[PDB]
């Protein structure tokens, strides 16, 4: 299977390159090898964009 990630806190993006999200929202990771911001797909909005890795945690 896969490991999803969960938002720990709300976040309001400043650029449309980044997702805005709310605590508890779940994401599939598209790419998390290029840096501290991860390209992700929200299972709530269906949008794809960057998320800050310090705002999420893996499902556990």
């Amino acid at each position: 299977g896969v490991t999803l990630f969960v938002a720990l806190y709300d976040y309001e993006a400043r650029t449309e390159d980044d997702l805005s999200f709310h605590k508890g929202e779940k994401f599939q990771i598209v790419n998390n090898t290029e840096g501290d911001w991860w390209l992700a797909h929200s299972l709530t909005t269906g949008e794809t964009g960057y998320i800050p890795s310090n705002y999420v945690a893996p499902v556990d």
Binding site: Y9, D36, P52, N54
Partner: peptide, 12 residues
């Protein structure tokens, strides 16, 4: 710096 490598936001 590319989008992946920007500074992270502070924790809330």
């Amino acid at each position: 710096v590319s989008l992946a490598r920007r500074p992270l936001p502070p924790l809330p």
